[PDB]
Amino acid sequence: MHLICQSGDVLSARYEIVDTLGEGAFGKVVECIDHKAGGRHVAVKIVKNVDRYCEAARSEIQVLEHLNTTDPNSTFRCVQMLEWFEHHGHICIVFELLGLSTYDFIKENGFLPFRLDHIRKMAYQICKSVNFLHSNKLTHTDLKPENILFVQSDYTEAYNPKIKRDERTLINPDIKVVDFGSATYDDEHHSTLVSTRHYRAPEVILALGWSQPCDVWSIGCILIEYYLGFTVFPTHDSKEHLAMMERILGPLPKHMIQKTRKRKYFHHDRLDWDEHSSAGRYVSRACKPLKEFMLSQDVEHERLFDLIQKMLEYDPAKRITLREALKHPFFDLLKK
Ligand SMILES: O=C1N=Cc2ccc3c(-c4ccccc4)c(Br)[nH]c3c21
Ligand SMILES: [Br-]
Ligand code: NA
């Protein structure tokens, strides 16, 4: 891929590569000049020439033709796909050009959180967008801050005496949702494993089956990360992940424990986790009950945390739907 994704390379006798916007497992996304469309900049996803990513790219193209036809104006803020082509055996998907991902903005700003009023707007848009998917018999399955992009990531920058550091303040917090290569229709095969680990729902970890509610779980994780500026379940070990969950949210429901095929995590229907081991003391000291993460007792913080708590309901059958989430009091300040 390195040989065809360089600055200056031309794709499909039309798109001149400017630079790389980001890289993933799948390949990379590059900003290009569209020399046919008078020099307009676009984003081109160059997909690795590897079966699993080719297949996901083909699936993404189908999902986006469906979504972009149903919502041609992007009222529901899914990214607009413009075209696709093949270039030296790589599938390339052209999209409208967006700004930084919400993840990169956090990272570039030194892992500082977003302001609450921005979180409120971003959350509403994310819920609206994913609800539109949920209304069309789709589950995204891979929601994460890297897949939520600012329409424009421009910021103002000033020294802030309070934290004795320069600080970027986002100008326009409008977002779009990207990456529909894992999105699954209600009547299609469900992989056992979905979502990036940190955003993965307990029903997925426990291999209990999943559907739209697993997106809601991922959104809860995203919102807490927007609030705090860091990932709340940063581990790569499933058992430790579940231990973190229990410290933050309390014990898993017994019926879910009883149903799982992943017997290895449990012993006599409780998590098989030594709280006094090294890893265990770390989980106790670093994690804590969800509400203790609040940085203020002000009612707007309480409202956000009530919503996050409901999104992080363990039992997916009881978890708040995005339809209900859009009516939550946290969003009242957006409404006339
Ligand atoms: O500007 C864009 N218009 C569509 C699009 C899709 C994915 C991206 C990404 C991206 C996201 C996750 C991992 C790697 C890259 C960036 Br950063 N910019 C993108 C755009
Ligand atoms: Br980015
Ligand atoms: Na998770």
Author numbering: 0, 148 to 482
Text of the article:
The CLK protein kinase family is closely related both in structure and function to the family of dual-specificity tyrosine phosphorylation-regulated kinases (DYRKs). The ATP binding pockets of CLK1 and DYRK1A are rather similar both in terms of sequence and surface shape.
The structure analysis revealed a binding mode resembling the orientations of 8g in CLK1 and of 8a in CLK3. While the lactam substructure of 16 forms hydrogen bonds to the hinge region, the indole nitrogen is connected to the hinge via hydrogen bonds through a water molecule. Substitution of the parent structure 8a at position 2 by either methyl (8k) or bromine decreased the selectivity towards the DYRK family more than tenfold.
